[PDB]
Amino acid sequence: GPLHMIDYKEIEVEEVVGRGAFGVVCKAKWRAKDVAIKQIESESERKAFIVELRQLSRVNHPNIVKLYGACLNPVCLVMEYAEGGSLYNVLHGAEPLPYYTAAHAMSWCLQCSQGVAYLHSMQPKALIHRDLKPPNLLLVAGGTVLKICDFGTAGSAAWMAPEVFEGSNYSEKCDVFSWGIILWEVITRRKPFDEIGGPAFRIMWAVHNGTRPPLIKNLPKPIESLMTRCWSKDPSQRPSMEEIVKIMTHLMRYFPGADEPLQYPCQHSLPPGEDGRVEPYVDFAEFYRLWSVDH
Ligand SMILES: CC(C)Oc1c(NC(=O)c2csc3c(=O)[nH]cnc23)cccc1C(=O)N1CCN(C)CC1
């Protein structure tokens, strides 16, 4: 795909917003447009920079970040600016947190899977993201449109498939595991394996033994099936991302109002930690209503 060579004199850096998977993201202006620039900081992030630049350029999809171009002095990428911030920040970040609905949660997960499905259909070899998690998912258009960023692989223990941290023969089915966890996360508004915590290896061990995050009380069985399939030990028993996009598209019939921008605040307090099952943040009342009207 097309790319622009950037003169750094054409960039006016406004403020530093935070760090990506590598480097530093800064809000900027270029060609009088609102951009986000990602500067390398460690010089050891050179491999990551080359990988992201290599992938983002050939990738072209509504649910993957627009790469506008690159500047080589100093070494930085010029991408689109995400107004809403990361999905992680929307779920768990700074108070006051925005209120969101089951429709949003389902819509976000559909959009995410849409991007990943595109990546998995790349020619001649599939493109695996290898790092799917809410900090690498961005929200634009008032939090109604999701974009995948941070392709530096193409603190992640909670979203990683068991075969990945085992160094084993992993395929694109590891992305499917990640998506499974993300689905659980947006439904519950809980950090996966927050209960476990510790350092990384404590989660890795838990997941490796077959620990998955707790089941959700009152969750629809078709969503529950999809979720628990996505996080099977055997990679072959997980669905394809092509199948996930189709299933999720069809469930959106029972999730209307997904295009309503995040605007209402939320004062969020959490139920007891481990009961076996957890309460969803979102309400499935309307789902069940619209379902029984059809079925
Ligand atoms: C992850 C973070 C930087 O994400 C935000 C962004 N990010 C972007 O616009 C962005 C555009 S491209 C791109 C990328 O490739 N990686 C990470 N972020 C981006 C913007 C505003 C707030 C946030 C946001 O959650 N922080 C709020 C403030 N906190 C100190 C840091 C997190």
mmCIF file of C-alpha atoms and ligand atoms in Angstrom:
data_model
loop_
_atom_site.group_PDB
_atom_site.id
_atom_site.type_symbol
_atom_site.label_atom_id
_atom_site.label_comp_id
_atom_site.label_asym_id
_atom_site.label_seq_id
_atom_site.Cartn_x
_atom_site.Cartn_y
_atom_site.Cartn_z
ATOM 1 C CA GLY A 1 0.000 0.000 0.000
ATOM 2 C CA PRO A 2 0.889 3.741 -0.358
ATOM 3 C CA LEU A 3 3.197 5.528 2.132
ATOM 4 C CA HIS A 4 4.443 9.103 2.677
ATOM 5 C CA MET A 5 8.017 10.169 3.412
ATOM 6 C CA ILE A 6 7.876 12.803 6.118
ATOM 7 C CA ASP A 7 9.967 15.914 6.729
ATOM 8 C CA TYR A 8 10.083 16.501 10.532
ATOM 9 C CA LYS A 9 9.848 20.277 9.909
ATOM 10 C CA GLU A 10 6.289 19.569 8.653
ATOM 11 C CA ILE A 11 5.393 18.003 12.056
ATOM 12 C CA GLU A 12 4.411 20.204 15.018
ATOM 13 C CA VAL A 13 4.487 18.020 18.177
ATOM 14 C CA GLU A 14 1.838 19.250 20.652
ATOM 15 C CA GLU A 15 2.044 16.942 23.724
ATOM 16 C CA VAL A 16 3.215 13.482 24.817
ATOM 17 C CA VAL A 17 0.186 11.206 25.395
ATOM 18 C CA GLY A 18 1.944 8.043 26.643
ATOM 19 C CA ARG A 19 3.830 4.912 25.603
ATOM 20 C CA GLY A 20 2.776 2.246 23.093
ATOM 21 C CA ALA A 21 3.940 -1.386 23.057
ATOM 22 C CA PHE A 22 7.239 0.228 22.135
ATOM 23 C CA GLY A 23 8.270 3.885 21.969
ATOM 24 C CA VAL A 24 6.412 7.096 22.794
ATOM 25 C CA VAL A 25 3.168 8.312 21.227
ATOM 26 C CA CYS A 26 2.830 12.100 20.917
ATOM 27 C CA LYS A 27 -0.097 14.208 19.711
ATOM 28 C CA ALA A 28 0.995 16.313 16.726
ATOM 29 C CA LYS A 29 -0.089 18.254 13.636
ATOM 30 C CA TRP A 30 1.064 17.463 10.074
ATOM 31 C CA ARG A 31 -0.349 18.855 6.788
ATOM 32 C CA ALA A 32 -2.749 20.687 9.163
ATOM 33 C CA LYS A 33 -4.243 17.312 10.240
ATOM 34 C CA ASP A 34 -4.555 15.707 13.694
ATOM 35 C CA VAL A 35 -1.904 12.969 13.821
ATOM 36 C CA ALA A 36 -0.205 10.801 16.438
ATOM 37 C CA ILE A 37 3.543 10.279 16.028
ATOM 38 C CA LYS A 38 5.337 7.247 17.468
ATOM 39 C CA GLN A 39 9.003 7.880 18.274
ATOM 40 C CA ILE A 40 11.527 5.185 19.115
ATOM 41 C CA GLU A 41 13.222 5.888 22.477
ATOM 42 C CA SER A 42 15.417 2.882 23.362
ATOM 43 C CA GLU A 43 17.150 2.367 19.953
ATOM 44 C CA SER A 44 16.727 -1.327 20.909
ATOM 45 C CA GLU A 45 13.154 -0.939 19.562
ATOM 46 C CA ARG A 46 14.587 -0.866 15.990
ATOM 47 C CA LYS A 47 13.399 -4.421 15.144
ATOM 48 C CA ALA A 48 9.908 -3.529 16.458
ATOM 49 C CA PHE A 49 9.871 -0.290 14.414
ATOM 50 C CA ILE A 50 10.841 -2.104 11.171
ATOM 51 C CA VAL A 51 8.196 -4.816 11.823
ATOM 52 C CA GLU A 52 5.347 -2.316 12.478
ATOM 53 C CA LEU A 53 6.382 -0.197 9.440
ATOM 54 C CA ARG A 54 6.598 -3.351 7.278
ATOM 55 C CA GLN A 55 3.147 -4.645 8.309
ATOM 56 C CA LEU A 56 1.063 -1.419 8.645
ATOM 57 C CA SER A 57 2.020 -0.405 5.081
ATOM 58 C CA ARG A 58 0.714 -3.594 3.410
ATOM 59 C CA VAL A 59 -2.354 -3.681 5.705
ATOM 60 C CA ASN A 60 -5.452 -1.742 4.588
ATOM 61 C CA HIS A 61 -8.712 -2.119 6.591
ATOM 62 C CA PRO A 62 -11.348 0.046 8.472
ATOM 63 C CA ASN A 63 -10.466 -1.592 11.836
ATOM 64 C CA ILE A 64 -6.669 -1.242 11.660
ATOM 65 C CA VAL A 65 -4.906 2.103 12.326
ATOM 66 C CA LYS A 66 -4.121 4.318 9.324
ATOM 67 C CA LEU A 67 -0.380 4.717 8.770
ATOM 68 C CA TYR A 68 0.112 8.106 7.112
ATOM 69 C CA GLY A 69 3.885 7.812 6.795
ATOM 70 C CA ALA A 70 7.337 7.688 8.362
ATOM 71 C CA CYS A 71 10.146 10.108 9.144
ATOM 72 C CA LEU A 72 13.696 8.703 9.343
ATOM 73 C CA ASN A 73 15.314 11.726 11.057
ATOM 74 C CA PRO A 74 14.343 11.457 13.780
ATOM 75 C CA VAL A 75 13.104 7.854 13.361
ATOM 76 C CA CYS A 76 9.290 7.927 13.826
ATOM 77 C CA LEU A 77 5.939 6.717 12.441
ATOM 78 C CA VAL A 78 3.078 9.098 11.590
ATOM 79 C CA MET A 79 -0.322 7.514 12.290
ATOM 80 C CA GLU A 80 -3.880 8.634 13.043
ATOM 81 C CA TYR A 81 -4.730 10.043 16.461
ATOM 82 C CA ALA A 82 -7.234 8.103 18.557
ATOM 83 C CA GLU A 83 -9.474 10.571 20.434
ATOM 84 C CA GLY A 84 -11.004 7.976 22.783
ATOM 85 C CA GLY A 85 -7.624 6.537 23.778
ATOM 86 C CA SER A 86 -7.063 2.809 24.193
ATOM 87 C CA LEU A 87 -9.852 0.309 24.939
ATOM 88 C CA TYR A 88 -7.967 -0.614 28.123
ATOM 89 C CA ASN A 89 -8.117 3.024 29.231
ATOM 90 C CA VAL A 90 -11.859 3.186 28.467
ATOM 91 C CA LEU A 91 -12.576 0.031 30.491
ATOM 92 C CA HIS A 92 -10.149 0.371 33.411
ATOM 93 C CA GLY A 93 -8.388 3.729 33.057
ATOM 94 C CA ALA A 94 -8.849 7.206 34.486
ATOM 95 C CA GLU A 95 -11.954 8.163 36.467
ATOM 96 C CA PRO A 96 -14.514 9.245 35.511
ATOM 97 C CA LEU A 97 -15.020 6.132 33.383
ATOM 98 C CA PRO A 98 -17.551 6.203 30.530
ATOM 99 C CA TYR A 99 -20.718 4.132 30.689
ATOM 100 C CA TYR A 100 -21.097 1.578 27.883
ATOM 101 C CA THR A 101 -23.750 -0.966 26.905
ATOM 102 C CA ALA A 102 -23.760 -4.651 25.887
ATOM 103 C CA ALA A 103 -24.177 -3.363 22.308
ATOM 104 C CA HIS A 104 -20.844 -1.500 22.577
ATOM 105 C CA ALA A 105 -19.055 -4.512 24.066
ATOM 106 C CA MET A 106 -20.354 -6.767 21.295
ATOM 107 C CA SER A 107 -19.688 -4.102 18.621
ATOM 108 C CA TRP A 108 -16.098 -3.570 19.783
ATOM 109 C CA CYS A 109 -15.388 -7.325 19.752
ATOM 110 C CA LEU A 110 -16.916 -7.693 16.297
ATOM 111 C CA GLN A 111 -14.788 -4.842 14.928
ATOM 112 C CA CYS A 112 -11.667 -6.271 16.541
ATOM 113 C CA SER A 113 -12.319 -9.731 15.042
ATOM 114 C CA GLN A 114 -13.019 -8.071 11.655
ATOM 115 C CA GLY A 115 -9.520 -6.557 11.699
ATOM 116 C CA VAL A 116 -7.919 -9.819 12.835
ATOM 117 C CA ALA A 117 -9.840 -11.862 10.209
ATOM 118 C CA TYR A 118 -8.420 -9.502 7.564
ATOM 119 C CA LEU A 119 -4.906 -10.104 8.929
ATOM 120 C CA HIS A 120 -5.387 -13.883 8.896
ATOM 121 C CA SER A 121 -6.444 -13.806 5.205
ATOM 122 C CA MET A 122 -3.235 -12.086 4.014
ATOM 123 C CA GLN A 123 -1.298 -13.533 1.022
ATOM 124 C CA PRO A 124 0.773 -15.593 0.651
ATOM 125 C CA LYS A 125 1.332 -16.173 4.392
ATOM 126 C CA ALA A 126 -1.154 -15.231 7.131
ATOM 127 C CA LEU A 127 -0.376 -12.211 9.308
ATOM 128 C CA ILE A 128 -0.557 -12.976 13.041
ATOM 129 C CA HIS A 129 -0.821 -9.999 15.448
ATOM 130 C CA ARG A 130 0.790 -11.948 18.333
ATOM 131 C CA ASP A 131 -0.123 -9.259 20.920
ATOM 132 C CA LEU A 132 -3.926 -8.766 20.932
ATOM 133 C CA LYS A 133 -5.028 -7.002 24.134
ATOM 134 C CA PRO A 134 -7.071 -3.899 25.138
ATOM 135 C CA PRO A 135 -4.012 -1.548 25.371
ATOM 136 C CA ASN A 136 -3.354 -2.247 21.659
ATOM 137 C CA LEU A 137 -6.949 -1.494 20.647
ATOM 138 C CA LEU A 138 -7.878 2.144 19.990
ATOM 139 C CA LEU A 139 -11.250 3.920 19.964
ATOM 140 C CA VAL A 140 -12.259 6.637 17.492
ATOM 141 C CA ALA A 141 -15.549 8.359 16.425
ATOM 142 C CA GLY A 142 -16.803 8.893 20.005
ATOM 143 C CA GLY A 143 -15.785 5.379 21.085
ATOM 144 C CA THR A 144 -17.924 3.596 18.469
ATOM 145 C CA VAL A 145 -15.116 2.559 16.091
ATOM 146 C CA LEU A 146 -12.278 0.246 17.115
ATOM 147 C CA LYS A 147 -8.816 0.051 15.493
ATOM 148 C CA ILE A 148 -5.989 -2.443 16.040
ATOM 149 C CA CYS A 149 -2.527 -0.900 16.632
ATOM 150 C CA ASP A 150 0.921 -1.986 17.982
ATOM 151 C CA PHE A 151 2.111 -4.466 15.336
ATOM 152 C CA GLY A 152 5.620 -4.622 16.897
ATOM 153 C CA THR A 153 5.450 -8.415 17.293
ATOM 154 C CA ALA A 154 3.472 -9.346 14.098
ATOM 155 C CA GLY A 155 2.785 -7.620 30.558
ATOM 156 C CA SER A 156 0.715 -9.643 28.055
ATOM 157 C CA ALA A 157 0.453 -12.834 30.157
ATOM 158 C CA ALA A 158 -3.308 -12.533 30.787
ATOM 159 C CA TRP A 159 -4.128 -12.482 27.048
ATOM 160 C CA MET A 160 -1.506 -14.989 25.827
ATOM 161 C CA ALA A 161 -2.286 -18.511 24.607
ATOM 162 C CA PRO A 162 -0.601 -21.415 26.500
ATOM 163 C CA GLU A 163 1.290 -22.634 23.382
ATOM 164 C CA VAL A 164 2.814 -19.144 22.903
ATOM 165 C CA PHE A 165 4.666 -18.862 26.237
ATOM 166 C CA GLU A 166 5.601 -22.561 25.860
ATOM 167 C CA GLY A 167 7.576 -21.548 22.716
ATOM 168 C CA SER A 168 5.548 -24.259 20.937
ATOM 169 C CA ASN A 169 4.260 -24.543 17.344
ATOM 170 C CA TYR A 170 1.762 -21.668 17.459
ATOM 171 C CA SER A 171 -0.408 -20.486 14.569
ATOM 172 C CA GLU A 172 -2.976 -17.712 14.036
ATOM 173 C CA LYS A 173 -5.144 -19.570 16.601
ATOM 174 C CA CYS A 174 -3.274 -17.757 19.383
ATOM 175 C CA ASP A 175 -4.974 -14.502 18.278
ATOM 176 C CA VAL A 176 -8.281 -16.358 18.743
ATOM 177 C CA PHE A 177 -7.357 -17.077 22.404
ATOM 178 C CA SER A 178 -6.576 -13.380 22.957
ATOM 179 C CA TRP A 179 -9.923 -12.376 21.462
ATOM 180 C CA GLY A 180 -11.651 -14.879 23.807
ATOM 181 C CA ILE A 181 -10.156 -13.102 26.839
ATOM 182 C CA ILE A 182 -10.946 -9.612 25.436
ATOM 183 C CA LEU A 183 -14.601 -10.704 25.080
ATOM 184 C CA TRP A 184 -14.704 -11.782 28.725
ATOM 185 C CA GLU A 185 -13.043 -8.493 29.709
ATOM 186 C CA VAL A 186 -15.485 -6.050 28.024
ATOM 187 C CA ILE A 187 -18.534 -8.006 29.314
ATOM 188 C CA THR A 188 -17.253 -7.946 32.929
ATOM 189 C CA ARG A 189 -15.163 -4.705 32.985
ATOM 190 C CA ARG A 190 -12.558 -6.681 34.964
ATOM 191 C CA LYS A 191 -8.833 -7.137 34.436
ATOM 192 C CA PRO A 192 -8.186 -10.803 33.507
ATOM 193 C CA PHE A 193 -6.350 -12.674 36.300
ATOM 194 C CA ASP A 194 -6.299 -9.612 38.561
ATOM 195 C CA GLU A 195 -7.107 -12.098 41.348
ATOM 196 C CA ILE A 196 -3.834 -13.959 40.620
ATOM 197 C CA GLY A 197 -1.564 -10.954 39.935
ATOM 198 C CA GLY A 198 2.028 -11.405 41.145
ATOM 199 C CA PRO A 199 4.672 -11.247 38.419
ATOM 200 C CA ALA A 200 4.094 -12.635 34.876
ATOM 201 C CA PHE A 201 5.018 -16.313 35.533
ATOM 202 C CA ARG A 202 2.255 -16.749 38.155
ATOM 203 C CA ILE A 203 -0.416 -16.135 35.490
ATOM 204 C CA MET A 204 1.481 -18.195 32.877
ATOM 205 C CA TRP A 205 1.513 -21.149 35.279
ATOM 206 C CA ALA A 206 -2.200 -20.703 36.072
ATOM 207 C CA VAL A 207 -3.279 -20.459 32.384
ATOM 208 C CA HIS A 208 -0.974 -23.404 31.554
ATOM 209 C CA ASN A 209 -2.792 -25.591 34.103
ATOM 210 C CA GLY A 210 -6.118 -24.685 32.473
ATOM 211 C CA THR A 211 -7.173 -21.675 34.567
ATOM 212 C CA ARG A 212 -9.499 -19.401 32.633
ATOM 213 C CA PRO A 213 -11.248 -16.284 33.987
ATOM 214 C CA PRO A 214 -14.487 -17.020 35.956
ATOM 215 C CA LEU A 215 -17.751 -17.731 34.107
ATOM 216 C CA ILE A 216 -20.324 -14.934 33.852
ATOM 217 C CA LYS A 217 -23.673 -15.251 35.644
ATOM 218 C CA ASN A 218 -26.687 -14.723 33.333
ATOM 219 C CA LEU A 219 -24.564 -14.866 30.135
ATOM 220 C CA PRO A 220 -26.321 -16.061 26.899
ATOM 221 C CA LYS A 221 -25.266 -19.631 26.003
ATOM 222 C CA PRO A 222 -24.313 -18.777 22.369
ATOM 223 C CA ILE A 223 -21.907 -16.040 23.633
ATOM 224 C CA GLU A 224 -20.722 -18.398 26.419
ATOM 225 C CA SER A 225 -19.995 -21.149 23.847
ATOM 226 C CA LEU A 226 -18.001 -18.829 21.581
ATOM 227 C CA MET A 227 -15.995 -17.497 24.553
ATOM 228 C CA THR A 228 -15.109 -20.905 26.085
ATOM 229 C CA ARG A 229 -14.228 -22.356 22.649
ATOM 230 C CA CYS A 230 -11.869 -19.440 21.946
ATOM 231 C CA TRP A 231 -9.895 -20.357 25.032
ATOM 232 C CA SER A 232 -9.404 -24.124 24.639
ATOM 233 C CA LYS A 233 -6.010 -25.699 25.456
ATOM 234 C CA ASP A 234 -5.985 -27.469 22.063
ATOM 235 C CA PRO A 235 -5.405 -24.759 19.391
ATOM 236 C CA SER A 236 -7.298 -26.806 16.773
ATOM 237 C CA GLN A 237 -10.537 -26.730 18.829
ATOM 238 C CA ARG A 238 -10.648 -22.910 18.720
ATOM 239 C CA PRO A 239 -12.804 -21.325 15.965
ATOM 240 C CA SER A 240 -11.326 -19.494 12.978
ATOM 241 C CA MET A 241 -11.526 -15.694 13.079
ATOM 242 C CA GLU A 242 -13.584 -15.943 9.834
ATOM 243 C CA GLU A 243 -16.160 -17.939 11.822
ATOM 244 C CA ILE A 244 -16.084 -15.429 14.730
ATOM 245 C CA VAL A 245 -16.806 -12.481 12.369
ATOM 246 C CA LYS A 246 -19.822 -14.358 10.948
ATOM 247 C CA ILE A 247 -21.240 -15.408 14.353
ATOM 248 C CA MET A 248 -20.716 -11.920 15.832
ATOM 249 C CA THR A 249 -22.326 -10.189 12.790
ATOM 250 C CA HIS A 250 -25.441 -12.326 13.310
ATOM 251 C CA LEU A 251 -25.652 -11.682 17.056
ATOM 252 C CA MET A 252 -25.577 -7.882 16.416
ATOM 253 C CA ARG A 253 -29.279 -8.155 15.494
ATOM 254 C CA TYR A 254 -29.953 -8.555 19.226
ATOM 255 C CA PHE A 255 -27.512 -5.754 20.107
ATOM 256 C CA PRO A 256 -28.903 -2.455 18.731
ATOM 257 C CA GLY A 257 -27.672 1.085 19.513
ATOM 258 C CA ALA A 258 -23.996 0.194 19.066
ATOM 259 C CA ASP A 259 -23.359 3.447 17.127
ATOM 260 C CA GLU A 260 -24.247 5.709 20.088
ATOM 261 C CA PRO A 261 -21.127 7.675 21.239
ATOM 262 C CA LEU A 262 -19.786 7.232 24.796
ATOM 263 C CA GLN A 263 -21.055 10.263 26.722
ATOM 264 C CA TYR A 264 -22.707 9.244 29.983
ATOM 265 C CA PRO A 265 -20.423 8.914 33.020
ATOM 266 C CA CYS A 266 -20.212 5.863 35.291
ATOM 267 C CA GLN A 267 -19.242 5.452 38.939
ATOM 268 C CA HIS A 268 -17.993 1.884 38.888
ATOM 269 C CA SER A 269 -17.706 -0.336 41.975
ATOM 270 C CA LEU A 270 -16.867 -4.053 41.725
ATOM 271 C CA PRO A 271 -18.739 -7.089 43.237
ATOM 272 C CA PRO A 272 -16.852 -9.760 45.367
ATOM 273 C CA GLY A 273 -13.644 -11.103 43.734
ATOM 274 C CA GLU A 274 -14.037 -14.895 43.433
ATOM 275 C CA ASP A 275 -17.435 -16.604 43.888
ATOM 276 C CA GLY A 276 -16.996 -19.105 41.049
ATOM 277 C CA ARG A 277 -19.090 -16.825 38.827
ATOM 278 C CA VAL A 278 -19.071 -13.041 38.220
ATOM 279 C CA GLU A 279 -21.722 -10.407 37.449
ATOM 280 C CA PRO A 280 -21.501 -8.836 33.993
ATOM 281 C CA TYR A 281 -21.048 -5.074 33.819
ATOM 282 C CA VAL A 282 -23.422 -5.051 30.827
ATOM 283 C CA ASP A 283 -27.155 -5.985 30.846
ATOM 284 C CA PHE A 284 -28.467 -8.911 28.798
ATOM 285 C CA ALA A 285 -32.172 -8.193 29.475
ATOM 286 C CA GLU A 286 -32.767 -6.562 26.062
ATOM 287 C CA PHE A 287 -30.859 -9.370 24.280
ATOM 288 C CA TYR A 288 -33.149 -12.029 25.766
ATOM 289 C CA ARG A 289 -36.227 -9.917 24.938
ATOM 290 C CA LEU A 290 -35.330 -9.489 21.226
ATOM 291 C CA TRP A 291 -34.212 -13.120 20.986
ATOM 292 C CA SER A 292 -37.532 -14.593 22.206
ATOM 293 C CA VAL A 293 -39.367 -12.261 19.756
ATOM 294 C CA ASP A 294 -37.467 -14.058 16.938
ATOM 295 C CA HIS A 295 -37.271 -17.561 18.460
HETATM 296 C C1 LIG B 1 -1.836 3.432 24.493
HETATM 297 C C2 LIG B 1 -1.965 4.924 24.635
HETATM 298 C C3 LIG B 1 -0.785 5.705 24.096
HETATM 299 O O1 LIG B 1 -3.199 5.265 23.941
HETATM 300 C C4 LIG B 1 -3.727 6.551 23.942
HETATM 301 C C5 LIG B 1 -3.744 7.246 22.716
HETATM 302 N N1 LIG B 1 -3.182 6.593 21.572
HETATM 303 C C6 LIG B 1 -3.245 6.911 20.233
HETATM 304 O O2 LIG B 1 -3.898 7.858 19.782
HETATM 305 C C7 LIG B 1 -2.443 6.018 19.293
HETATM 306 C C8 LIG B 1 -2.436 6.239 17.943
HETATM 307 S S1 LIG B 1 -1.462 5.119 17.097
HETATM 308 C C9 LIG B 1 -1.019 4.298 18.551
HETATM 309 C C10 LIG B 1 -0.158 3.161 18.683
HETATM 310 O O3 LIG B 1 0.402 2.589 17.745
HETATM 311 N N2 LIG B 1 -0.003 2.742 19.997
HETATM 312 C C11 LIG B 1 -0.603 3.340 21.062
HETATM 313 N N3 LIG B 1 -1.400 4.382 20.998
HETATM 314 C C12 LIG B 1 -1.622 4.891 19.658
HETATM 315 C C13 LIG B 1 -4.287 8.537 22.666
HETATM 316 C C14 LIG B 1 -4.813 9.114 23.818
HETATM 317 C C15 LIG B 1 -4.805 8.424 25.028
HETATM 318 C C16 LIG B 1 -4.261 7.140 25.124
HETATM 319 C C17 LIG B 1 -4.317 6.460 26.468
HETATM 320 O O4 LIG B 1 -5.103 5.542 26.618
HETATM 321 N N4 LIG B 1 -3.477 6.877 27.464
HETATM 322 C C18 LIG B 1 -3.955 7.843 28.477
HETATM 323 C C19 LIG B 1 -2.766 8.531 29.258
HETATM 324 N N5 LIG B 1 -1.832 7.520 29.813
HETATM 325 C C20 LIG B 1 -0.716 8.154 30.541
HETATM 326 C C21 LIG B 1 -1.323 6.661 28.733
HETATM 327 C C22 LIG B 1 -2.484 5.933 28.020
#
